[PDB]
């Protein structure tokens, strides 16, 4: 992995994680966000908090993290620490008493074309209006609002990966049944 | 502190002290680490969780011949207080903890004497497994 060593040394020689990763500042950073729900940990009706285990798949392109594979022994993909690069500052706006942003900085998958995939985990504690009128036969509509805290739409654009959250790896609950799910 | 600053400069920068390496002349030797425990207070024994919470002070004593000096050459200085991150440490941990707190709580300064003895008394709050006989 001398090829990848040289590549990683070249890509980060004069790299800035401060500036947006675009060739020209008038361009917008196009970010694809997809939420995957692994587990519905808890529904606290008294404090109106829903605790979920999630994976926040984020995909974008970094203009300055490209290379030709032929110049590096055919290396087409690498995994690098996420802390070294610029990332979108996605925040759970309706965080109740958990973390506002991602705190588990897992590795990003970088392609030679500059494409970045970053799928960090999170424990989302979200504030949900809980209607107890019909308990124990109650239905609850609980939301997770996600947005770039400091970047507006004119510099960073976020787009849903899919119209629905990813429930392919969802662990069945013994207390709730997700009747419907959708991202807007 | 011309003297203590000059002594630390002599020990760590002039002689190139490497805290990653053990204080042995050859690799096949073993470092003798003397341990004692002082129980400051027995905080509790929770039976339902079967957990013993104690406040203890672990006295570590070992020899580091790299950290020797002549007291008369350095203003009759006989003891130094140094951060523990500056010296090699015999990293002792509580093996039978039940909460993931393997290490001491407060990494206090090491006391290094001119004849090469390193004394270190970190205090710790430890939560340990204690199976309970309810008979």
């Amino acid at each position: 992995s001398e090829h990848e060593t040289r590549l990683v040394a070249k890509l980060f020689k004069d790299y800035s994680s401060v500036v947006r990763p675009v060739e020209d500042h008038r361009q917008v950073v196009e970010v694809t966000v997809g939420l995957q729900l692994i587990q519905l940990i808890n529904v606290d009706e008294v404090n109106q908090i829903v605790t979920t285990n999630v994976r926040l798949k984020q995909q974008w392109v970094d203009y300055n993290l490209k290379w030709n594979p032929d110049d590096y022994g055919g290396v087409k993909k690498i995994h690098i620490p996420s802390e070294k690069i610029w990332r979108p500052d996605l925040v759970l706006y309706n965080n109740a008493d958990g973390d506002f942003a991602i705190v588990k900085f897992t590795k990003v998958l970088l392609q030679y074309t500059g494409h970045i995939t970053w799928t960090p985990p999170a424990i989302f504690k979200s504030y949900c209006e809980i209607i107890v009128t019909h308990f124990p036969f109650d239905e609850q509509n609980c939301s997770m609002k996600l947005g770039t805290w400091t970047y507006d739409g004119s510099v960073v654009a976020i787009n849903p990966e899919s119209d629905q959250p990813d429930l392919s790896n969802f662990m069945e609950s013994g207390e709730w049944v997700i009747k419907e799910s959708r991202g807007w | 502190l011309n003297e203590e600053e000059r002594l630390i400069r002599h020990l760590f920068q002039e002689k190139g002290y490497n805290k990653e390496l053990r204080p042995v002349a050859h690799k096949e030797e073993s470092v003798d680490v003397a341990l004692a425990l002082t129980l400051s207070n027995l905080i509790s024994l929770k039976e339902v969780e079967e957990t013993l919470t104690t406040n203890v002070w672990i006295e570590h004593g070992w020899t580091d011949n790299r950290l020797k000096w002549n007291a008369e050459e350095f203003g009759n200085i006989s003891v130094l207080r140094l951060p523990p991150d500056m010296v090699w440490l015999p990293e002792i941990v509580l093996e039978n903890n039940n909460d993931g707190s393997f290490q001491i709580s407060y990494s206090c300064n090491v006391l290094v004497y001119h004849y090469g003895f390193v004394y270190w008394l970190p205090p710790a709050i430890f939560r340990s497994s204690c199976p309970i006989s309810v008979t």
């Binding site: 992995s1 090829h3 990848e4 060593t5 990683v8 040394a9 590096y72 022994g73 055919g74 290396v75 690498i78 995994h79 690098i80 620490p81 | 490497n18 990653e20 390496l21 053990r22 042995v24 050859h26 690799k27």
Partner: peptide, 28 residues
């Protein structure tokens, strides 16, 4: 431990702990 020190210095000269060690590109 001066032999150990020299060996460690040689071992970690040019070493990158973030790069997966694959002898050749494509190796697992």
């Amino acid at each position: 431990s001066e032999a150990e020190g020299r060996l460690r210095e040689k071992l970690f000269s040019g070493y990158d702990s973030s790069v997966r060690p694959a002898r050749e590109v494509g190796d697992r």
